[PDB]
Design a protein around this ligand. Structure first.
Ligand SMILES: Nc1ncnc2c1ncn2[C@@H]1O[C@H](COP(=O)(O)OP(=O)(O)O)[C@@H](O)[C@H]1O
Ligand SMILES: [Cl-]
Length: 150
């Protein structure tokens, strides 16, 4: 039933906007957070801005929410496979995630963010997953989504 709503927007600006919403909260929790955009990351793109924003906001937001100390990095780059694949990696410094808990992370229902993000990523012909090296190692949430180049 779901359908992409396409328009042209500045992808770089979208990342800075997300960081601007999250930063004051990171500051209160004393979690340094960094954004890195690859030198070849397209600027003006065609895609569904409000759905892309929802995905990035919930994953970056989760990093802040579930981290008690340490830093967070948000990295945006291109996955080579007109269109391209945007990759976003969000690495936090949480307590880590047990292997048994990862396969059910998109279906854990308290909490709706990742379930919604998964549908949006699927709409953009993409892939999303979370991984953790275990105790004390935080986790990385990663997604690839297809976007048009303006
Ligand atoms: N960055 C993260 N660090 C640790 N656990 C996470 C992270 N992101 C998601 N999770 C786990 O996945 C579950 C589902 O997350 P989400 O769908 O965003 O819902 P919510 O944040 O409301 O719980 C969370 O409750 C949590 O157990
Ligand atoms: Cl974690």
């Amino acid at each position: 039933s779901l359908q992409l709503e396409l328009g042209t927007f500045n992808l770089h600006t979208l990342f800075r906007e997300v960081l601007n919403l999250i930063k004051p909260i990171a500051v209160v929790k004393k979690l340094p957070i960094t954004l890195n955009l690859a030198p070849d990351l397209p600027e003006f793109v065609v895609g569904d801005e409000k759905r892309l924003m929802q995905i990035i906001l919930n994953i970056v937001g989760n990093a802040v929410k579930f981290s008690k100390q340490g830093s967070i990095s948000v990295t945006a780059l291109v996955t080579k496979s007109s269109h391209f694949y945007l990759r976003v990696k969000v690495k936090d410094s949480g307590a880590g995630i047990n292997p048994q808990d990862i396969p059910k992370i998109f279906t854990k229902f308290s909490g709706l963010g990742l379930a919604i993000s998964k549908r949006f990523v699927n709409l953009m012909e993409g892939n999303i997953w979370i991984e953790s090296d275990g105790l004390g190692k935080g986790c990385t949430a990663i997604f690839d989504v297809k976007l048009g180049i303006s």
